[PDB]
Design a protein around this ligand. Sequence first.
Ligand SMILES: *[C@@H]1O[C@H](CO)[C@@H](O[C@@H]2O[C@H](CO)[C@@H](O)[C@H](O)[C@H]2NC(C)=O)[C@H](O)[C@H]1NC(C)=O
Ligand SMILES: *[C@@H]1O[C@H](CO)[C@@H](O[C@@H]2O[C@H](CO)[C@@H](O)[C@H](O)[C@H]2NC(C)=O)[C@H](O)[C@H]1NC(C)=O
Ligand SMILES: *[C@@H]1O[C@H](CO)[C@@H](O[C@@H]2O[C@H](CO)[C@@H](O)[C@H](O)[C@H]2NC(C)=O)[C@H](O)[C@H]1NC(C)=O
Ligand SMILES: *[C@@H]1O[C@H](CO)[C@@H](O[C@@H]2O[C@H](CO)[C@@H](O)[C@H](O)[C@H]2NC(C)=O)[C@H](O)[C@H]1NC(C)=O
Ligand SMILES: *[C@@H]1O[C@H](CO)[C@@H](O[C@@H]2O[C@H](CO)[C@@H](O)[C@H](O)[C@H]2NC(C)=O)[C@H](O)[C@H]1NC(C)=O
Ligand SMILES: *[C@@H]1O[C@H](CO)[C@@H](O)[C@H](O)[C@H]1NC(C)=O
Ligand SMILES: *[C@@H]1O[C@H](CO)[C@@H](O)[C@H](O)[C@H]1NC(C)=O
Ligand SMILES: *[C@@H]1O[C@H](CO)[C@@H](O)[C@H](O)[C@H]1NC(C)=O
Ligand SMILES: *[C@@H]1O[C@H](CO)[C@@H](O)[C@H](O)[C@H]1NC(C)=O
Ligand SMILES: *[C@@H]1O[C@H](CO)[C@@H](O)[C@H](O)[C@H]1NC(C)=O
Ligand SMILES: *[C@@H]1O[C@H](CO)[C@@H](O)[C@H](O)[C@H]1NC(C)=O
Ligand SMILES: *[C@@H]1O[C@H](CO)[C@@H](O)[C@H](O)[C@H]1NC(C)=O
Ligand SMILES: *[C@@H]1O[C@H](CO)[C@@H](O)[C@H](O)[C@H]1NC(C)=O
Ligand SMILES: *[C@@H]1O[C@H](CO)[C@@H](O)[C@H](O)[C@H]1NC(C)=O
Lengths: 237, 427, 338, 147
Amino acid sequence: AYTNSFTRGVYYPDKVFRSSVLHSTQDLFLPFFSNVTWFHAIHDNPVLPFNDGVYFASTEKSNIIRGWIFGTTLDSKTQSLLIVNNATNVVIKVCEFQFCNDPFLGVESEFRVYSSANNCTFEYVSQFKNLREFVFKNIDGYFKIYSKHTPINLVRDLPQGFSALEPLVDLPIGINITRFQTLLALHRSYLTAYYVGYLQPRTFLLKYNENGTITDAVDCALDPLSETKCTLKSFTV
Amino acid sequence: EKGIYQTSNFRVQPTESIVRFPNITNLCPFGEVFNATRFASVYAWNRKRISNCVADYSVLYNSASFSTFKCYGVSPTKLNDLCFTNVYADSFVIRGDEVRQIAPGQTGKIADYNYKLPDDFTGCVIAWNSNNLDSKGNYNYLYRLFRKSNLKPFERDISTEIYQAGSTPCNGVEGFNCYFPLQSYGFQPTNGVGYQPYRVVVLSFELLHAPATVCGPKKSTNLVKNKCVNFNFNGLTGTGVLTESNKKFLPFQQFGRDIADTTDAVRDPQTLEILDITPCSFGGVSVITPGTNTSNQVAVLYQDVNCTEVPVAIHADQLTPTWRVYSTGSNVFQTRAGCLIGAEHVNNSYECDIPIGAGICASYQTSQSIIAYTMSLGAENSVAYSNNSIAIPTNFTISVTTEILPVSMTKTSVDCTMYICGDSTEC
Amino acid sequence: AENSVAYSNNSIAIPTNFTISVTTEILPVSMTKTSVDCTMYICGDSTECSNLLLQYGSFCTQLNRALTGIAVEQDKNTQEVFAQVKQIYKTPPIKDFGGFNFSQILPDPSKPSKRSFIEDLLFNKVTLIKQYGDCLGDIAARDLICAQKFNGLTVLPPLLTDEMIAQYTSALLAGTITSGWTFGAGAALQIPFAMQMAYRFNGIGVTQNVLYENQKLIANQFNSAIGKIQDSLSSTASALGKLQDVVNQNAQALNTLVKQLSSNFGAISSVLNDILSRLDPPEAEVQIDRLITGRLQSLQTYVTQQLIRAAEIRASANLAATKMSECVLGQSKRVDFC
Amino acid sequence: GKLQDVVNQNAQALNTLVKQLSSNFGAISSVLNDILSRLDPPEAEVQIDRLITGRLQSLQTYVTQQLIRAAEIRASANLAATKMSECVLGQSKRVDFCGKGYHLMSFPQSAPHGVVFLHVTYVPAQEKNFTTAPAICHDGKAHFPRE
Ligand SMILES: *[C@@H]1O[C@H](CO)[C@@H](O[C@@H]2O[C@H](CO)[C@@H](O)[C@H](O)[C@H]2NC(C)=O)[C@H](O)[C@H]1NC(C)=O
Ligand SMILES: *[C@@H]1O[C@H](CO)[C@@H](O[C@@H]2O[C@H](CO)[C@@H](O)[C@H](O)[C@H]2NC(C)=O)[C@H](O)[C@H]1NC(C)=O
Ligand SMILES: *[C@@H]1O[C@H](CO)[C@@H](O[C@@H]2O[C@H](CO)[C@@H](O)[C@H](O)[C@H]2NC(C)=O)[C@H](O)[C@H]1NC(C)=O
Ligand SMILES: *[C@@H]1O[C@H](CO)[C@@H](O[C@@H]2O[C@H](CO)[C@@H](O)[C@H](O)[C@H]2NC(C)=O)[C@H](O)[C@H]1NC(C)=O
Ligand SMILES: *[C@@H]1O[C@H](CO)[C@@H](O[C@@H]2O[C@H](CO)[C@@H](O)[C@H](O)[C@H]2NC(C)=O)[C@H](O)[C@H]1NC(C)=O
Ligand SMILES: *[C@@H]1O[C@H](CO)[C@@H](O)[C@H](O)[C@H]1NC(C)=O
Ligand SMILES: *[C@@H]1O[C@H](CO)[C@@H](O)[C@H](O)[C@H]1NC(C)=O
Ligand SMILES: *[C@@H]1O[C@H](CO)[C@@H](O)[C@H](O)[C@H]1NC(C)=O
Ligand SMILES: *[C@@H]1O[C@H](CO)[C@@H](O)[C@H](O)[C@H]1NC(C)=O
Ligand SMILES: *[C@@H]1O[C@H](CO)[C@@H](O)[C@H](O)[C@H]1NC(C)=O
Ligand SMILES: *[C@@H]1O[C@H](CO)[C@@H](O)[C@H](O)[C@H]1NC(C)=O
Ligand SMILES: *[C@@H]1O[C@H](CO)[C@@H](O)[C@H](O)[C@H]1NC(C)=O
Ligand SMILES: *[C@@H]1O[C@H](CO)[C@@H](O)[C@H](O)[C@H]1NC(C)=O
Ligand SMILES: *[C@@H]1O[C@H](CO)[C@@H](O)[C@H](O)[C@H]1NC(C)=O
């Protein structure tokens, strides 16, 4: 099952204000018009690789998506990261868990995720017409997260325009990551709608309007017309 | 000689000197970091967050009792002038000969299997020996001997699986060439230096891009606007005029930049207003002179400056009094090329003598003075045209004129080795 | 188009009518005069950078002297083309030129300006001291002339104004129409305009009775050709490409010089004050010397390209001065020169 | 003055090249032998490479300005060769090419690095008004002047 992105997954790459310019940036981005894996539910959640970074989207209306599991082997021989969304805060925890085979949350909260939390190094806590987008990155001992949410009107897939993601939090977790896993809240607790893309090193050309907002971009390795636009440093040829 | 010359440039000097730091007064827990009863082993290094306090590093580096104090992207002298972002403290204990390996780009197996600094490291590394507190026979300081790969920067590996070193597995068992990956420091009070314990603290931070919570013990000042001042906004020194702005910063932004990578917008730390930053008044000066064979009188053109903004543009009374013959007065005249001072504007027209620009010239006339006029194109004339008249000449003149043209120039050669090196064989 | 001539050894072709043709030729004369304050480009206000820059000698004295030479040559270029006669010949009062109508190229007598209708059309087509002193408010902070001015880059005005250049061309026109070619060799000698046209017809090998017998047809063909020039200028928007090229090349070179100030050239930062906030002078010197070397290289590249462009526009102005004196002050026999 | 400018520009360019030898370009001294008297080769090399870089830059700036000046004087000499053959070896009809007025003849004289032309022209002097006509009618026939 696949869809395509069209433009999605661009973020503010620094914390300086800029207005009415163009700017060239080399970073880890999600390419334009890539095919992204589609996971749906009508009546599974496997482990997926990380691969230098992940774009994550999920639309919902009844609050099914709650947090993720990050780590390299997920079986209490190394550390791992746990992010869990609650009713009115979020719980970040780097800790040597032993995770269940199919972890979920119950109806009220049943932490059926892990079975033995040991050697626990970091812990943190702070405060279809809804789309939310995420970018995760793991570089030299940090964990960066970018986020944006918007009211979707669409019927099946991601829209066409332009939204840029703002920085959320940076976490000093210091570990090695290879795979990841999504945590849901099931309707009935049986111990037995989101999209995933991958980031590539690219060069992008970004535009800022008068008010400091990223409104348009050019993916320089898409096609020869945009390679021309990046060489000329303009949007018009 | 007679002409007009660009000589230097004028630049109004700043008037005050302001400092704008966030209002905060708490003291940083550096005693809780340095004066801890028990430090960590190196394979499990401890990371402590420092936030929202006033740090005074000069106590640390002056009243030292330290052996190593190396700061990397920054000088130790400037540390009480900056504000800092995402400040963290690492802390562990190692051997004396292995203090060498806590540096960017270095080998060993502390640096390769235990604790790795990146190459673009900003921060400081502090060490001091601790044999009185870390002795007997002390076997409470472990380190790793064998790993499969090399670590990344700022990556912590705490896992004791049996290192397979042959071809056959060893499933949770120590056996043939299968080792336990951690081995303890054999500390004694009877060792020589190089085997005695040292305590190490690593501070690490970013500088000057993001909003800040940790900084230094210097006192804020009032905010003065509409004047040239010498400011400081959380460590960002500069010069210019400040003015209220209409830019809306997002909350994760503190500064803004131009196309020359120049800071032009700033957010105040105490008030949360956005100001814009613009340098002082400046421009070129041109000096109109006759020959010094003739006089010592000059006129001065301040290029593309209005005439009432000159005693702001040059300062009034920071210069000598012999610069205030040429800043106001009665010989003050406004051309489209700037403001001219020291010449008398007459109403005639002449052939151009010293060109000024946009139709204006200057000359040394009548005793003597310097005048400025609009130049004349030539003598006005009119032809007596009609539809049945002609003019025929009745005489003529034989004329002889000259024309001068360059043909050739001087032929030169350079001996490169004698120009560059003289007679030095090493060069 | 493929063609063939019907050559024979006893055949000739003789023309039986003619056409009066009016065409256009466009030439560049001068370019924009600029100056750079190098100490403000290289160092800003920093007196530490300013004392380090004295170790490299007289490089900025050399660059300023090269740009002052270019700026003086542009005013010589304009004098050489337009100031060929020194009498300001006044426009003749009653236009009786044998049926020939010159009203779109002469200045209009009601308006006190010096520009003609066609000169108005030409000045409204090239898309080019006033924003200097400005740039204090922050909506004037996204245009390119303030970012040029704040780093030491300046534009100097021309010595002759546009009104003065139009006064010169007005005098050259009045001299030609009332005197033929006599005012270029001496004093102006008046002649009626159809007699002037008859002896120019004689200059290309046609007898003057051909002109006197076809005088009204010839004046109508001329008036129609002027009207067609005016329509093609009044609605077509690429005619002055040679003049727009010069403006574009100059603005592009200055923008590249401004954008090179955000390269670090191998230093820790491209911002001199951010180097100065974090380091003390013995290790700050290593960074400031790299920045100085890079910025000096950028300025020297700019000045070299300007000198080669100045030589090209000097040759073009020499050609324009020769065309003024050989096609406006005389009748020319060189094939395709006019 | 046009001949004196060429002498002045070139003497000035050579004097600037000589004076650039007293810049240290970031070294400890501008004197190579004073660097060699105080230092040993592995760290004298760091100073001598700075001096070498600065002096190579000075020479290359000089040579580029000479090539641009030489191109300008080549165009001036092409014009002087055209004037020699069209005004001294002939009579010219190009307006203002060989003086002001109607050209009769020209004479050349030699000058230091140059050439002076003496142009002889005819200039009309004292004019009178007359009444004129394009043609004259005699017997129902029109008559036009021959010259
Ligand atoms: C991060 O964890 C991965 C997962 O184990 C490590 O990748 C392994 O590296 C060893 C090196 O000896 C290889 O033999 C394995 O085949 C690798 N496995 C996979 C799935 O890639 C990686 O080395 C770790 N990173 C660091 C810096 O230690
Ligand atoms: C030719 O005739 C014209 C017209 O009569 C003369 O022009 C006048 O010259 C006098 C000077 O004596 C002026 O005061 C008048 O204003 C002129 N009139 C016009 C209409 O311009 C002209 O001088 C005569 N030429 C000669 C050589 O005698
Ligand atoms: C043409 O002009 C010349 C001037 O070059 C006149 O010659 C002068 O005539 C006066 C009076 O006869 C003498 O005082 C001068 O000495 C003469 N000059 C020379 C150089 O000989 C000449 O008379 C004029 N001819 C006419 C017909 O007007
Ligand atoms: C020479 O060519 C002109 C065209 O320029 C001819 O004039 C045209 O004649 C026709 C018929 O008489 C008219 O309809 C046009 O209006 C005329 N044009 C103009 C501008 O007047 C002229 O007849 C030709 N003469 C000969 C002998 O062939
Ligand atoms: C010379 O040509 C101009 C063309 O611009 C003529 O001016 C126009 O003449 C018409 C009459 O048919 C008027 O309606 C317009 O108002 C005139 N335009 C302007 C701009 O004045 C002018 O009449 C011609 N000269 C003669 C003597 O006919
Ligand atoms: C990705 O999806 C596009 C959509 O048409 C498809 O053409 C392409 O083959 C897919 N990629 C791969 C590797 O199959
Ligand atoms: C989740 O929210 C509940 C609601 O108050 C709270 O009591 C609890 O502490 C939160 N955290 C966890 C881990 O359950
Ligand atoms: C981790 O936990 C285990 C048992 O829970 C303990 O023996 C060990 O000392 C801990 N610390 C490490 C491995 O640093
Ligand atoms: C930029 O901000 C101004 C002021 O709020 C607003 O008028 C304008 O519409 C904004 N621009 C865009 C493209 O929304
Ligand atoms: C640490 O403790 C010693 C005494 O044990 C004291 O002299 C020193 O000032 C303390 N340093 C800090 C930073 O608290
Ligand atoms: C301290 O900063 C806050 C931030 O808004 C401000 O309201 C308050 O007035 C400041 N205190 C002083 C004494 O300036
Ligand atoms: C200075 O000017 C005077 C007067 O013009 C002149 O006689 C004298 O020679 C000049 N000095 C020099 C050195 O030329
Ligand atoms: C100079 O300033 C005065 C007063 O502000 C103003 O009237 C005048 O227009 C200014 N000059 C120019 C050239 O704008
Ligand atoms: C020049 O003429 C103007 C008339 O427009 C007059 O106002 C001015 O005072 C005159 N200048 C002098 C010096 O008389």
